[PDB]
UniProtKB/Swiss-Prot annotation, chains A, B, C, D, E:
Keywords: Amyloid, Amyloidosis, Cytoplasm, Disease variant, Gamma-carboxyglutamic acid, Glycoprotein, Hormone, Neuropathy, Phosphoprotein, Secreted, Signal, Sulfation, Thyroid hormone, Transport. Changing E55K: In AMYLD1; amyloid polyneuropathy. Changing F53M: Loss of tetramerization. Changing I50N: In AMYLD1; vitrous amyloid. Changing E55Q: In AMYLD1; amyloid polyneuropathy and cardiomyopathy. GO terms for biological process: negative regulation of glomerular filtration; phototransduction, visible light; purine nucleobase metabolic process; retinoid metabolic process. This is Transthyretin. Changing Y80H: In CTS1; amyloid deposit on carpal tunnel; patients show no other abnormalities. Changing Y35H: In AMYLD1; leptomeningeal amyloidosis; vitreous amyloid in some patients. Changing A63G: In AMYLD1; amyloid polyneuropathy. Thyroid hormone-binding protein. Probably transports thyroxine from the bloodstream to the brain. Changing Y82S: In AMYLD1; amyloid polyneuropathy. The lineage of its organism: Eukaryota, Metazoa, Chordata, Craniata, Vertebrata. It comes from Homo sapiens. Changing A75T: In DTTRH; increased affinity for thyroxine.
């Protein structure tokens, strides 16, 4: 088997290429993400131990997400060539 | 088997190519995402331990998602060539 | 097996390439992310020990996320060539 | 097996390439991230010891995230060639 | 196995390349990050000893993150060639 990914590219090219070849909670022999970004990810109640709230319990669950937040991202995971990039606010 | 992905591209090209060849909770020998991004993902109640709320329990479940949030993203996972990109607000 | 990733690229190219070849909580022989960035990630209640809240407990759960926050990022994980990048606010 | 990553690149190129070849909580023989950055990551309640809140306990959980914070980053994990980068605010 | 990373690059190139080849809490034979930076990372309650809050305890948990903070970073983990970098505020 031969992998002919990219050859003979002459001029003014912006290219993003990725190649990989392979031939309670348990995971084996895996890959999640080669190029991975994440912004403001939240997980709250997952994978609690064996027998949670074993005997005679009560809780109050409150979570507040109120706030002024500003994400200013330009050219994220994206290559350029002969360009003009700006953020003017 | 031969993989002829991309050859002889002359001028002014922006290209995104990915190639891979393969020939309670349990997962084996998998791949989720080669190019993966995610913005504001939430999971609340999943994969609790064996026997949750074992005996005589009561809860109050409240979750608030109120807030002023601004996502300003341009050219995310997208290549350019001979371009002009700007965010002017 | 041969991996022909990138050869004979003449002029003015910006390229992002990654290649890898492989042929209670337990994980073995894995890779999460080769190029990984994350901004403001939060996890609150996950993977508590065996038998949480063993006997006769009560809690109050409050979490506040209110605040003025400004993310100013340009050209994150994205290469340029013959360009002009600026953030003028 | 041969890994032909990058040869014969003539002029004015900015390139980011990474290659790796491999052929209660327990993790073995893994790699998280070759190029990893993270800004303002927070984890609050995870992986508490065996039997947390063993007998007859109550707590008050408050966390405040309010504050004026300014992130000013340009050209993070992104190479340039023949460019002009500035942050003028 | 041969690793052909980078040869015959003629002029005006800025390149970032990394390659590695390998063929209660316990971790063995791993690598977290070859190039790693992190700004303002906080972890609050994780990996407490066996049997925390053993008998008849109560706590008040307050944490304040309010303050004027300014991060001014340019060209972080990103090489340049024939460039002009400045921060003029």
């Amino acid at each position: 088997l031969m992998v002919k990914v990219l050859d003979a590219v002459r001029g003014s090219s912006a290219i993003n290429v990725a190649v990989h070849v392979f031939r309670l909670t348990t995971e084996e022999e895996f890959v999640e993400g080669i190029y991975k970004v994440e912004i403001d990810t939240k997980s709250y109640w997952k994978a609690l131990g064996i027998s949670p709230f074993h005997e005679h319990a009560e809780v109050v669950f409150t979570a507040n997400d109120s706030g002024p937040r500003r994400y200013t991202i330009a050219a994220l995971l994206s290559p350029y060539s002969y360009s003009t990039t700006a953020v003017v606010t």
